[PDB]
Amino acid sequence: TIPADDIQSAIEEYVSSFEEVGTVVDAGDGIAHVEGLPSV
Amino acid sequence: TTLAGELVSVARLLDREAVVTRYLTVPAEDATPRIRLIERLVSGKVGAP
After folding, report:
1. At what angle do helices B32-41 and A7-16 cross, to 10 degrees?
2. Burial tier of B8 (Cβ tally within 10 Å: 0-12, 13-18, 19+)
3. A24 at B interface, C-beta within 8 A
4. Which residues in chain A touch residue B9, judged by CB atoms under 8 angstroms apart?
5. What share of chain A is helix, strand, coil (3-state, %, to 5)?
6. CB atoms < 10 A from the CB of A5, how many?
7. Do residues A11 and B20 lie in contact, with contact meaning Cβ atoms separated by under 8 Å?
8. A16 interfaces chain B, CB cutoff of 8 Å
């Protein structure tokens, strides 16, 4: 079942786990959206 | 049958914490931290396959 409310630790570590490349997801009119690049 | 039970249980677990689902559902290339995350969630809770 559900853990003992340690989920935040998991995710916070997932974030603390952060050569980097992103990918363009949208483009048009001179404006782009870039997925990735967690440290820009 | 226990595969089905545990998989629907972890589905409940996913729909219970939306933020962790958002995090593990990033469409990124080096997804390896994600996989760590998930086993970190149920390392000793469910079956191996």
Report:
1. 160
2. exposed
3. no
4. 1
5. 25, 30, 40
6. 7
7. yes
8. no
